[PDB]
Design a protein around this ligand. Structure first.
Ligand SMILES: Cc1ccc(-c2ccc(CCC(=O)N[C@@H](CCC(=O)O)C(N)=O)cc2)s1
Ligand SMILES: [Ca+2]
Ligand SMILES: [Ca+2]
Ligand SMILES: [Zn+2]
Ligand SMILES: [Zn+2]
Length: 159
């Protein structure tokens, strides 16, 4: 339905952490993941440590109150809701995963980056090179930039 945010400065909050990474590694992964979309659009992402952000980020297991349960290790890594009020925009990560910042399954930055596409209103692409491809695979992250198909997608929505 072409659901999109109607402001360019959006806020986010990290509500909890996974045990497999320092808080600063989680924080860094989320920040970089938002930055990939920011360098390609008018969107500006601002962190809050509490209170009511546009995008809540959380790690949960199995049933977690939104009627799309997670499934234990592998399979669904994360999900995220389309722009909108309330749960709109929020991104949940399967606490049962191995979460890394290395080439080993699963790179938290890469999964967040994909999820935030969904959070900003993108659907999946059929382009096997795109971030918004429906399946995960690791790609070099040390200066990962948005693939051109995903630049096209975010620009199509937000300029
Ligand atoms: C370098 C990359 C290119 C593409 C990457 C990617 C692709 C897909 C994911 C999520 C993979 C995932 O968890 N998919 C749920 C649906 C939720 C959703 O679509 O977000 C399922 N299996 O049903 C994470 C990362 S990483
Ligand atoms: Ca899972
Ligand atoms: Ca929200
Ligand atoms: Zn959820
Ligand atoms: Zn997806």
């Amino acid at each position: 339905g072409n659901p999109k945010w109607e402001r360019t400065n959006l806020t986010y909050r990290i509500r909890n952490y996974t045990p497999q990474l320092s808080e600063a590694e989680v924080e860094r992964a989320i920040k970089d993941a938002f930055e990939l979309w920011s360098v390609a659009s008018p969107l500006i992402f601002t962190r809050i440590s509490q209170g009511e952000a546009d995008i809540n980020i959380a790690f949960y297991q199995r049933d977690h109150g939104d009627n799309s349960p997670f499934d234990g290790p592998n399979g669904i890594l994360a999900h995220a809701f389309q722009p909108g009020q309330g749960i709109g925009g929020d991104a949940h990560f399967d606490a049962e995963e191995t979460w890394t910042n290395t080439s080993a399954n699963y790179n938290l930055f890469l999964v967040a980056a994909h999820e935030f596409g969904h959070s900003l209103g993108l659907a999946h692409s059929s382009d096997p090179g795109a971030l918004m491809y429906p399946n995960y695979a690791f790609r070099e992250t040390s200066n990962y930039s948005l693939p051109q198909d995903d630049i096209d997608g975010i620009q199509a929505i937000y300029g």
